[PDB]
Amino acid sequence: AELLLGVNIDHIATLRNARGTAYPDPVQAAFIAEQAGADGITVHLREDRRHITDRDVRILRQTLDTRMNLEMAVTEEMLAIAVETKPHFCCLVPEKRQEVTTEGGLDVAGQRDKMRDACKRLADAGIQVSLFIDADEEQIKAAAKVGAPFIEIHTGCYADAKTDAEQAQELARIAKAATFAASLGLKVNAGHGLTYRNVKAIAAIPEMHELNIGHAIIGRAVLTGLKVAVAEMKRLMLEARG
Template identity: 60%
Template sequence: MLRLGVNIDHVATIRNARGTPWPDPMRAAKLVEEAGADGITAHLREDRRHIADADIDALMEGLRLPLNLEMAATAEMQTIALRHKPHAICLVPEKREERTTEGGLDVAGNDNALAHYITPLREAGSRVSMFIGAQPDQIRASARIGAAVVELHTGAYADYDTEGRIAERDAELAAIREGAALAASLGLEVHAGHGLTFDNVGPIAAIPEIRELNIGHFLIAESVFIGLPAAIREMRRRMDEARG
């Protein structure tokens, strides 16, 4: 079955907007567990704009589901990851001025440095994932440096769909399909995520090589109207329907 990981970053965004303890990301994680998701994703950014160090402490202590820690490839984040040893670590590009992650990591252009960076993370027992575009050189580089997983960035696909740019959307979808097949042929586990919604998740979920989708902002936004468990159950239903 196609797995669903839920990113809870934007529960923390709402909390931090007022500087109160509410809403609590750990409470959201418990609801995610109860609703039948397969994992929790949290991005500890360098500027701590949403998830905080204390949230990672709480998640590691209180979760039954595996934690996927998203982070930049910095010395500070490596130290934090080695202290916690989460189930999975997803390396992402990070710019302080961006609203959200704007593209994939350049593994091909930094393969030697990233190979050395991920070695202690792998030795500590975490599954290391590269958040990349579907370009063949990035996929091959991820396999070459010893990553276990690639997460294919679906943001451009989602943006083109929202904007009604059908030809570009279909071309991006074809690239993701081809990238997923290449990654699987190289022995990489394939995940995907970014910008996925009820309306656009189907074609991505239908790609047979993809094993996991990580979805956050839309589910947190939809939960304002229908509640988090209901949003997760509906996303799961649409994923399962697409997978057939």
């Protein structure tokens, strides 16, 4: 079915806000990204608004040719915004303070009801919720229980791994969780932390539906231009899988 690439243009709006001008404009950056291999555009709407802003969302929604993935914290402000914005996808992540795990995924197991409500509100809005969790059976059982169609497996630990032993351990943990998660009817995304040397093994995990990558692509864009960085990432995934 082929895995999709979702580019995360958060850190493009970081450059923009460092002098608070207009450029580089995340609206322009998504256009480039979409024409270079991306199958969707992810943006995180923090309440800090330090980087991506409501204008970015309001306009990105009107100009994407793909599909938006709205990263948000499950908060009444954001749940509200999610609903008028009607993004196709909507990924729930912890925020600053008590809603997170030591590894750093949304604590679903420990907020079971908060999430059940959130997932229902949003499904009722037409948006497919993804739950951003670590690869723990506990959190995955919780994810499935709460009714979210999707999970996004936090590959932070995999990228940060120092020795090859540790890298291989964390790889297998992800693959086993991706199988188990699918066994409970969940679809599986991954990607936070993925670099151009990480990406291939994760893309070969066949349960994987879509890899959402940001910081590594934007980092390379500054060197090579954003078009070549999206295309390099996408072509690496097609290689890893056919």
